[PDB]
Amino acid sequence: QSYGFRPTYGVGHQPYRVVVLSFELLHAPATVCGPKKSTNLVKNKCVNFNFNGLTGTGVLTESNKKFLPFQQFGRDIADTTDAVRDPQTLEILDITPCS
Amino acid sequence: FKNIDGYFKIYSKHTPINLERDLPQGFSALEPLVDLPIGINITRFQTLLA
Amino acid sequence: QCVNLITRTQSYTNSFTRGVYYPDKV
Numbered sequence: 001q002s003y004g005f006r007p008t009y010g011v012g013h014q015p016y017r018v019v020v021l022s023f024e025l026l027h028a029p030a031t032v033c034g035p036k037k038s039t040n041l042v043k044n045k046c047v048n049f050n051f052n053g054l055t056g057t058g059v060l061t062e063s064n065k066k067f068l069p070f071q072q073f074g075r076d077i078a079d080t081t082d083a084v085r086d087p088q089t090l091e092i093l094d095i096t097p098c099s
Numbered sequence: 100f101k102n103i104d105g106y107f108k109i110y111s112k113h114t115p116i117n118l119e120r121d122l123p124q125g126f127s128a129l130e131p132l133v134d135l136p137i138g139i140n141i142t143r144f145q146t147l148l149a
Numbered sequence: 150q151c152v153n154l155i156t157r158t159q160s161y162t163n164s165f166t167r168g169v170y171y172p173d174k175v
């Protein structure tokens with residue numbers, strides 16, 4: 001059946017553009033997420049940092065503790081969550097307790 | 100190749116040899132190559148030739 | 150369309166300490 005959709009039609013018959021957003025949660029997680037806010041790197045009186053998901057408080061530094069080009073984490077013998085390289089500039093970082 | 104939690108993680112590492120190979124007496128680690136998030140039921144596989 | 154001429158028998162051999170990979174990106 002055909003729609004008329006003349007400009008003088010009543011509100012009950014006026015056309016409405018309907019957009020439906022469908023979301024799937026199957027057993028196959030991927031990188032389909034929303035946008036995240038990005039800030040500037042801060043050290044020197046350590047501030048709280050949330051680098052790519054993990055959160056810490058240590059002193060960001062530019063030490064020569066070079067990781068592998070595929071690793072994105074850092075852990076000591078005590079499984080301490082060491083700093084991760086910069087997700088943007090790929091600069092290697094390291095953290096220590098802030099006194 | 101692995102299929103766990105939907106991620107088809109592929110590990111690989113190119114290692115040169117010197118003579119005939121029979122899985123020689125050497126150690127070498129494999130680095131992750133890709134992390135395809137498809138979650139495909141993979142129960143068979145065939146080596147593709149040219 | 151394909152031609153079936155690649156099928157052949159199998160064999161066995163002794164391996165070594167192979168297949169070790171990085172279980173995590175840490």
Ligand SMILES: *[C@@H]1O[C@H](CO)[C@@H](O[C@@H]2O[C@H](CO)[C@@H](O)[C@H](O)[C@H]2NC(C)=O)[C@H](O)[C@H]1NC(C)=O
Pocket residue numbers: 064065066
């Ligand atoms: C990984 O191992 C290599 C091989 O020893 C290290 O490279 C040496 O590093 C020291 C310290 O700076 C230098 O004095 C040597 O001259 C380097 N050797 C070579 C052949 O380059 C490398 O430092 C190690 N990686 C880390 C992160 O320590």
Ligand SMILES: *[C@@H]1O[C@H](CO)[C@@H](O[C@@H]2O[C@H](CO)[C@@H](O)[C@H](O)[C@H]2NC(C)=O)[C@H](O)[C@H]1NC(C)=O
Pocket residue numbers: 087088089
């Ligand atoms: C994210 O975007 C920033 C800004 O464009 C990139 O920083 C630039 O990096 C290039 C090197 O590739 C430099 O020549 C520019 O001077 C940088 N610009 C600024 C404003 O810092 C950064 O490389 C990008 N990161 C990724 C992973 O794409």
Ligand SMILES: *[C@@H]1O[C@H](CO)[C@@H](O[C@@H]2O[C@H](CO)[C@@H](O)[C@H](O)[C@H]2NC(C)=O)[C@H](O)[C@H]1NC(C)=O
Pocket residue numbers: 027138139140
């Ligand atoms: C893949 O095959 C499995 C069984 O061969 C299908 O059934 C799933 O099995 C797993 C574990 O046995 C369960 O956790 C799922 O709930 C099952 N799914 C259903 C719909 O019954 C499975 O459906 C196939 N496909 C996928 C994408 O896993």
Ligand SMILES: *[C@@H]1O[C@H](CO)[C@@H](O)[C@H](O)[C@H]1NC(C)=O
Pocket residue numbers: 161162163
């Ligand atoms: C591997 O298995 C085959 C058949 O199961 C057998 O003939 C062969 O001897 C085995 N390899 C070793 C090293 O035992």
